[PDB]
Amino acid sequence: XXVX
Amino acid sequence: VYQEPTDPKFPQQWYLSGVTQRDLNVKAAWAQGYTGHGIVVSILDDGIEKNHPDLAGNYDPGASFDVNDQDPDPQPRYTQMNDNRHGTRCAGEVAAVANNGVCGVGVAYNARIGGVRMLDGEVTDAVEARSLGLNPNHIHIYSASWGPEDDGKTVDGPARLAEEAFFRGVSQGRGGLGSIFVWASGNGGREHDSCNCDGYTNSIYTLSISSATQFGNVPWYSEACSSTLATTYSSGNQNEKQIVTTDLRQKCTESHTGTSASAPLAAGIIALTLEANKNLTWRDMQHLVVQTSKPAHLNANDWATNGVGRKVSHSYGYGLLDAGAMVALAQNWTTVAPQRKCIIDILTEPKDIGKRLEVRKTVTACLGEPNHITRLEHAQARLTLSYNRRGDLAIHLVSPMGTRSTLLAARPHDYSADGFNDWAFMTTHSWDEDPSGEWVLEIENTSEANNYGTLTKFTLVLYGTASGSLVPR
Ligand SMILES: [Ca+2]
Ligand SMILES: [Ca+2]
Ligand SMILES: [Ca+2]
């Protein structure tokens, strides 16, 4: 996987 | 007479108001008396600087939690690289304090703002679920500027706990009116990613928000797909202005960018709309977005008029949000009827894909039954198929009213041989159309290679009602  | 903010950087917030018309028409909502009073927004991200001089006045501990470290305090972890600045930048876009001599203002500068610290660690299904389901009778609106990798080869969505959190949120959250989930549509433009391969944006339970540059163009980072609902301004090239917000270490930045900035601005506009009518359901809010968003002077080569006369694009959905129009329409809005769901299993046998496959089916949309739909909301083509190189596929769905939705464009980097396993490709582009009639699914090999595969299941899932239509635009 979970990316900003 | 309404007095606009005096904050030092408010004149640089070109996207909030201007004489040029390149803005989100937020000042008009403020002038109508809506600044977010009484609404609670939570930023699900890497934390929130709760003591920031432009957030402290609006900070809400009841809208906040630290899921990564399992404590109530969402304060970011400070490092030399300032990695955990992202949630604080998003929060200030929603609800930075106004008229306090610091930085700029939030869209909903009198709303209450919290943060869930959940990205600074291993982001499991359980972490996501505990964040999406935080205090759902206190938090009205959840903003998420994160999601699956934008490498242009990933297909990934909420696992079981997170999907359960979405369903619990929209069903029992906010007193049964439903939690409002706002999602950033993605940063995979350079990889030719599709936001329909992201189950968070592609969910019917989220308002997936794309971006436009100051001069009205499709930013380099933008992903096109049929699940996007609408657009807010964000960054573009280096001659175009960017987003002004609260930064880590009690600073002010004028250079917040990308998909991350668009969802918070939408969350802020939705907060103003909720102030104007606290009885709006989660579906009401999507209807308002569809009816009020503005295509004008957004440049794209795929603008199409759907069956009810609304312009729609895979880059922008229904266009730019319009806060003044949202709050005005909200005030006397009549709650939509309960959501119906009509399930149509299309195939009678598996179909080889080859170079090109067209599946045509005439449907009655549950005629004569309690789930009869004459007014569509979301539609899904839930597809199960094998293929040797997934990214060579392009998939289109045509509604009975002639609206061609691109469910999947080619993804050059997607070499996967894993196909799609009941993947629920979603389109917003046929909203308010009558779904009775001929639907067409097209699957084609966009490459010269001799690819191969089989479509084994195609479920057309229609959501909507049977009442309350407007005269087409
Ligand atoms: Ca903590
Ligand atoms: Ca301020
Ligand atoms: Ca993506």
Ligand SMILES: [Cl-]
């Ligand atoms: Cl459902």
Ligand code: NA
């Ligand atoms: Na409910």
Ligand code: NA
């Ligand atoms: Na969505």
Ligand code: NA
């Ligand atoms: Na029809």
